[PDB]
Design a protein around this nucleic acid. Structure first.
Ligand SMILES: Nc1nc2c(ncn2[C@@H]2O[C@H](COP(=O)(O)OP(=O)(O)OP(=O)(O)O)[C@@H](O)[C@H]2O)c(=O)[nH]1
Ligand SMILES: Nc1nc2c(ncn2[C@@H]2O[C@H](COP(=O)(O)OP(=O)(O)OP(=O)(O)O)[C@@H](O)[C@H]2O)c(=O)[nH]1
Ligand SMILES: [Ca+2]
Ligand SMILES: [Ca+2]
Ligand SMILES: [Ca+2]
Ligand SMILES: [Ca+2]
Ligand SMILES: [Mg+2]
Ligand SMILES: [Mg+2]
Lengths: 897, 941
DNA sequence: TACCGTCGGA
RNA sequence: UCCGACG
DNA sequence: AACTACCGTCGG
RNA sequence: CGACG
């Protein structure tokens, strides 16, 4: 309680633009009758007054916190303050641009403030102040306004942000600015009318027509207003087709067959392409529209050019009138785009094996694939090392630097070589060095492969080229039969056969996470020309008793993606399983069903009652949301117990699958599940208080007895590790080495050159001896500071600074080339590198290459040039970074040779 | 004409006794030098003897160096064979990885008209690689020799009199075919000839029609009477042809048609695999029309097993398995498509009668080897051409509409291609990406193992643009780079206004195939792509539920473009990058397309709705009977043999008769060109491709393309008579106005081509070039003068340095003046020395400019490539200082390389990254990263 | 004054 | 442009 | 002390 | 880290 002054105080020193106030307050970095005064508001860069970029600042000052659909964000991080004298330390983050949302577009980003705060229901770090208290924290966040940068902030939403480092579990809480110093009673940022959270929520959800909803679920729908989305277009009432019924089963079971998905007209789809700047028209988008959320797919039957969209009951999360423009605006979160290979995750393996007709054969196949994959990998690197052009291509494919190059506009350099080992190899190879000839490169290439082996031991990867995660859609047009799916691609899906569609074959579909044996299903891919224009989506039938998506771990067509696999080896043994009869767990899982109406009865009728009920929902929902979550604990418990049983289909496996199936829906479903319910369910149905071990596959080595038997144990320890160990032993054998050597007669060329001049001139000899000596001093400082585990980059740079200081008559002017702004590009730099190489190449080779790699590459390129054999090119750092190896050149050139 | 016969006795270079020991590659390349340097190979004054070193040479320069020691050879050496070729000729038995070493010569008429002078001058070409063929694989590339020779029936004014005024044609033909020709130790006998078109005479020795003639080496000094290239067995041309054609079983064929099938043995192909007899299904009947017309519906195409397709992918290194290949297999020629019904794993192929061009037993393994000429591969956008436009207008439901559209399309296509280059020009990273996507240099880079240079810059203008931007030059700040981009665009505009190749995004040229499986109804076609076919608005992986136009070039009849319905059949989904026509109906759709079929024909396929939707199909034309003018010589091989009798001697004589008779037939003047041009002019002046004269001439040229294969005789008199009796007289029509570069007509253009070129293309091109010229910069760049400044300051305080600096200055103007004479002089534009040779001579003079510690420090003599020393930097800088405005082309072409070096040196900034000095080879293996260009620009904006 | 279209430069 | 195939 | 916190998809 | 299921 005495939680009475957590936020920074606002002084009357109170007329500053909101952006100016927050950035000035950001002083916190820490000064509390000094003559502080309001300097003369029109700044366009923060430096003029951990830094907000100017573009953000201009939009904050002049753009009303909005630009290109991006909103400036008032985000803050709160962490427990160490001192425990009679709580949190606020750290207002820099102003940043984040994608906007319905609520910020309708009321203004400046009126929204988001914080990351430690959960009060959490852990040793939690201060004793643990001895209380949660009600007091929740009251602090909800019951009252919060003053900050001259605005009164009220809380209206909370969501789990997960474990965060000050590690503890932190909540994201959202606040709305209801009033302020610049605010007006009953629009620019400064001239803002005062609006209560209760009205802001009533605008979004139209509570008067939704009091029948469980308030917990209603509260969860607030997330639609905060969904970060691209505003595409606004549609007119006569352009919106609200259906009053979903597509239902033809078998009369009553099941909804298009849960979450509707059609849009082809023109609407075109506007999406135009607004988002997309190479083609998207077949389907994940979006929001009024109360509706889910997927929209092009009506392949739309021949006109008129804009329209439909909604369905399964999509509309609350009764909406769709009157306000912002409730009629199509909002896209993502579009169905070109697919990539998915591989096979380990959760799928137990179910795949559980459903195999021949478990021994299915195991044998997965293992033979992995052995074939690892053997290919090891063999390809060995072949690549033989030729620089081939090794450059392999080194480029193993690690991606484009992100690092784009952010820097160049390959970043530490001292005389690029930061990364893979860039050091390519850079040095581009200058003519050979890994099989220059030991320095040989060693580097040895590290990377040795580190690559260590990455394989840690993580088991079964990669299947013929798999992909794909948005799921339902078949509005009735062309697909119950067990048929349609899959066409927007481009070539490449597997070392290639595909543009799937036709006349079986496929597996699943959703991750898969738990029940039926959470994977085998189906027949049939390409229907009627659907040819829908690409990068998989289309399920709308016939049959139950929608196929429902079978995929309770899936639907509202944004769900399916794992789709058409690898014939993985598919052919699979035997479908009926959906499981889920046990009754109500003894352990209590559902709070209280409706908004029931909440209101406590207060009466009319605006005053409704507003009270609304702030009630918020506080109660905050309590629920802050209750410790057990999804992860129970998921891990299931993994450990199913491992022990080697079963995913027996009685405890179904129980745990049903349990975790309800723990994901916890916020929307109002499911209560505390520590005591977990202890009771374990005691009565599982292994009681016993703490379960971790599966053996969770460590790098087989620490068990006898040969591994669990499929994941078998693949990681009986297939993968022995193969990896065989390559490592081959690599360890190195000892064997007509070999790679540090010495390169090319790199001493400048040294020998200047030695001949020095022998005939005393004046030049003195400069040479000085140079030789100063280099010696720096090599001793490298031994001192580099060979000292303050940080390693800093220490290398420290020597590099001393190295670059080694500086030098027509001879001096020709050596120094003063007109060059970058002294590392003059002839003295070459000479220094050559002389250092000559004197320290065998004693201390890393010093020479780390200090002078850059110039050694220059010397090498110069020396290996041959008259009339083409021209070496001197690339600028920027232009060098934008180039990549040409895969076709390597294959074509290698074939010729 | 025995005066011609006199000048036809010492045409080939003599093979001296001192070179008999030489391997053929030696004899060839040694002979080439003697011929190029004007030294007599039997000159006794030189004391010539075989150098034993030549037998082990791995570089031709090593052999020629020995000759250049002699004073007689000390003129620039002739173009040299690449080293891998030469080694292959010396130790590889003339074959490497499916490539054959080729022996070729070019002949031109001797300008000397002495009665005793050689009629022709010979230039042996350097050994080279070309793809092999069945005949070179079966008998060895070293036994084949091909020449280009002037056609003795040429009527050009340039023909000497000894032939033009004389029995000369009969004497030349007899020279070619009567007996063996001695050359490099071997006896060569002609066995095939084909038209090689109009060729300019070599400068070393007015276009003339030349023939390509192929000789087989029947024997030679090292040959053995009845393998390595040197130990070869005697073999007669008559026998080699019998091996190819199995003449005993083909005497029923017209001998001229039989002769034309020799091309199948010479077709350049990749040998894939050899199938066993039991894997080969010879069909006795083609797929026939279901309506009983007898018409063949799969003319030239058959099925292969899925495993055969896989082997093709493997052997050729393809990304995926190709649905269809163009190939040869024994006597069969045509297309083979994967059997979509094949689920086994057994190798097999099938042949049809329409594919088999002679009766072949398929016993020999070389007659059982699938050979691939080409595969159906990823498609690209096509465009219109001058032949389609009049037919598209003829068939248009609204001529005025289509006319106005085609034009407005040309206009918008020009605007997008100018607007994309103008945006890209604003940032160097973006222009580089645009230049890289503009052209393809991968092929050249892979062959030379680097970017080839001419003097101080890459040869390509595209490579030069990127090479100089890679060193930091901006194309909006340096005029030399702007000028290069300008010239490049002009050239493309010139091509548009000359060829009117209007781009149509939704169009492609696609191999045609027939539907073996009966799923396509008549007038339905199936098109699936192997990957996304992009068009700015829409992208495609297949075509479904739309109308398409299909056509073949040459298109002449109104019905040579056909509008049909694209229907995607899931049964055929695995056949990609081909267009499949129906095998139902009375006539195969392929036949309607200028008489086409499925043996390698490609169709122009258009699915652009604005172009498709106005088109109205025409019915097939009522063709005239032209037998009065086109006379087919149908003489069979059997009939030829009756002149001689039966048995092996008779057959051998008949075979050589076929050859000589077919040479005479092949050397007769061809009228395809004249009659096609006549049709163009007539249809132009009438502005009609559908009236009676248009149909007659379309039917005529339709017959003359088939000429050599059909035995059609059509002489000058018959052309005249044909024009007289059917076409209103033997006239000489005006050239269309669009043949000229500016509008020479009166008033507004009337013909659609005139309209598009002169009303649309020309004004728009001048408009774009006006706005492109306004969206763009100086020659000067202070950075490039940094070294020049640096050294004036030194040489302002040193007399010795100043003397050096002045000699450099003076000698640069010396070479500059030489550049203005050899390259700049418009007079030198035509000279025996071509542009590259003239540049190099100036470059050599430039590189000859050459510099005590200051000299050592400038020279860096330990560097093997003096062009990388600091001197080369000072030289380029000074030259730039002096001539950046007066002679920009000179500075950049001589010193561009070092200028690039100085620029990258000067623009480097401390701690702002490191410039990278790439090796020439490593530089050529890199390509722009499109994903980097887009990611970086987005961060910038 | 004697053709056009598709590919490729081993 | 030149050279080499092909339709 | 010692129990004990999930999978997948895209982007950055 | 940032969204999303
Ligand atoms: N305009 C023009 N068209 C040509 C030329 N050469 C071939 N063609 C085209 O090719 C056609 C003949 O095609 P081919 O497949 O080579 O021969 P074919 O008529 O099918 O006869 P076969 O070889 O027995 O199958 C005709 C023309 O349409 C040419 O030089 N000029
Ligand atoms: N393992 C795991 N699955 C999640 C998590 N969050 C969402 N899911 C998956 O998403 C499912 C919830 O689907 P949603 O699309 O978000 O909502 P819904 O269940 O369809 O309910 P509505 O919003 O009313 O349509 C459940 C899970 O299968 C998570 O944190 N962990
Ligand atoms: Ca869902
Ligand atoms: Ca749902
Ligand atoms: Ca043909
Ligand atoms: Ca044919
Ligand atoms: Mg659901
Ligand atoms: Mg034909």
């Amino acid at each position: 309680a005495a939680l009475r002054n957590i936020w920074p105080k606002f002084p009357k020193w109170h007329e500053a633009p909101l952006a100016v106030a927050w950035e000035v307050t950001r002083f916190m970095h820490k000064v509390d009758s000094l003559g502080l005064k309001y300097d003369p508001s029109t700044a366009r860069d923060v430096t003029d007054i951990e830094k907000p970029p100017n573009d953000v600042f201009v939009t904050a000052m002049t753009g009303n916190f909005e630009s290109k659909g991006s909103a400036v964000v008032l985000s803050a991080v709160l962490d427990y303050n160490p001192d425990n004298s009679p709580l949190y330390l606020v750290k207002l983050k820099p102003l940043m641009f984040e994608q906007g949302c319905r609520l910020t577009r309708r009321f203004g980003p400046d009126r929204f403030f988001e914080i990351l705060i430690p959960s009060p229901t959490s852990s040793p770090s939690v201060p004793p102040v643990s001895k209380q208290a949660v009600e007091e924290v929740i009251q602090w966040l909800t019951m009252g306004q919060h003053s900050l940068v001259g605005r009164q902030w009220r809380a209206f939403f909370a969501k789990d942000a997960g474990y965060r480092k000050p590690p503890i579990i932190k909540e994201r809480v959202h606040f709305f600015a209801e009033t302020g110093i610049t605010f007006r009673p009953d629009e620019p940022v400064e001239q803002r009318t005062e609006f209560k959270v209760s009205q802001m929520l009533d605008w979004l959800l139209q509570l008067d027509n939704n009091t029948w909803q469980p308030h917990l679920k209603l509260f969860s729908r607030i997330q639609l207003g905060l969904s970060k989305t691209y505003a595409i277009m606004t549609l007119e009432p006569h352009q919106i087709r609200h259906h009053k019924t979903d597509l239902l089963s033809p078998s009369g079971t009553g099941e909804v067959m298009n849960d979450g998905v509707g059609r849009m007209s082809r023109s609407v789809a075109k506007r999406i392409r135009d607004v988002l700047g997309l190479g083609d028209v998207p077949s389907a988008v994940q979006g929001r529209f009024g109360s509706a959320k889910g997927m929209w797919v092009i009506d392949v039957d739309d021949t006109g050019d008129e804009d329209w969209i439909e909604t369905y009951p399964s999509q509309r999360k609350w009764e909406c009138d769709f009157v306000d423009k912002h409730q009629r605006t199509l909002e896209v979160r993502s579009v169905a785009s070109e697919l990539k290979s998915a591989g096979l995750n380990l959760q799928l393996l137990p179910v795949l094996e559980d459903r195999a007709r021949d478990k021994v054969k299915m195991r044998q196949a997965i293992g033979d694939r992995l052995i074939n994959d690892l053997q290919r990998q090891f063999s390809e690197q060995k072949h690549a090392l033989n030729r620089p052009v081939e090794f450059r291509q392999w080194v480029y494919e193993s690690y991606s630097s484009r992100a690092t190059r784009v952010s820097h506009g160049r390959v970043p350099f530490l001292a005389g070589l690029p930061d990364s080992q893979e860039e050091t190899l390519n850079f040095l190879m581009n200058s003519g060095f050979d890994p099989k000839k220059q030991k320095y490169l040989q060693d580097i290439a040895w590290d990377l492969q040795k580190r690559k082996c260590d990455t394989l031991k840690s993580k088991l990867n079964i990669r299947v080229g013929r798999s992909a995660y794909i948005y799921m859609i339902a078949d509005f047009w009735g062309v697909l039969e119950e067990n048929e799916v349609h899959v066409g691609f927007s481009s070539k899906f490449r597997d070392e056969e290639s595909f543009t569609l799937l036709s006349d074959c079986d496929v597996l579909v699943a959703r991750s996470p898969a738990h029940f044996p039926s959470d994977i299903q085998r189906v027949r891919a049939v390409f229907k020309p009627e659907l040819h224009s829908l690409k990068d989506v998989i289309i399920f039938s709308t016939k049959g008793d139950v929608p196929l998506a429902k079978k995929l771990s309770g899936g639907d067509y509202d944004g769900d993606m399916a794992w789709v696999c058409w690898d014939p080896e993985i598919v052919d043994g699979f035997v479908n399983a009926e959906m499981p009869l889920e046990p009754d767990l109500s003894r352990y899982l209590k559902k709070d069903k209280t409706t908004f109406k029931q909440l209101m009865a406590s207060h009466g009728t009319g605006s005053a009652a409704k507003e009270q009920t609304t702030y009630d929902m918020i506080q109660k929902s905050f309590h629920f949301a802050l209750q410790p979550n057990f999804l992860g604990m129970c998921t891990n418990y299931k993994e450990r117990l199913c491992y022990i049983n080697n079963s995913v289909s027996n009685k405890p496996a179904i129980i745990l699958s049903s349990l975790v199936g309800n723990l994901v829906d916890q916020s929307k479903q109002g499911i209560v599940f505390n520590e005591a319910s977990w202890a009771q369910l374990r005691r009565e149905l599982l292994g009681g208080a016993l703490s379960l071990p971790d599966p053996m596959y969770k460590s790098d080595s087989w620490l068990g007895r006898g040969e591994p038997t669990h499929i994941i144990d078998y693949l990681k320890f009986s297939i993968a590790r022995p193969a990896i160990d065989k390559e490592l032993e081959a690599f360890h054998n190195m000892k064997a080495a007509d070999g790679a050597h540090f010495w390169d007669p090319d790199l001493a060329s400048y040294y020998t050159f200047f030695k001949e001049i020095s022998d005939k001139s005393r004046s030049s000899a003195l400069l040479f001896t000085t140079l030789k000596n100063r280099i010696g001093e720096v090599e001793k400082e490298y031994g001192r500071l580099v060979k000292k585990e303050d940080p390693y980059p800093v220490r290398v740079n420290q020597v590099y600074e001393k190295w670059c200081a080694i500086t030098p008559s027509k001879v001096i002017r020709l050596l120094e080339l003063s007109f060059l702004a970058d002294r590392e590009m003059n002839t003295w730099a070459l000479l220094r590198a050559s002389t250092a190489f000559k004197l320290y190449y065998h004693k201390s080779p890393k010093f020479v290459w780390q200090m002078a790699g850059r110039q050694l590459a220059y010397i090498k390129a110069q020396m290996t040039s041959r008259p009339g054999e083409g021209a070496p090119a001197l690339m600028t750092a920027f232009m060098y970074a934008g180039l990549m190896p040409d895969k076709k050149f390597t294959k074509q050139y290698v074939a010729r040779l």
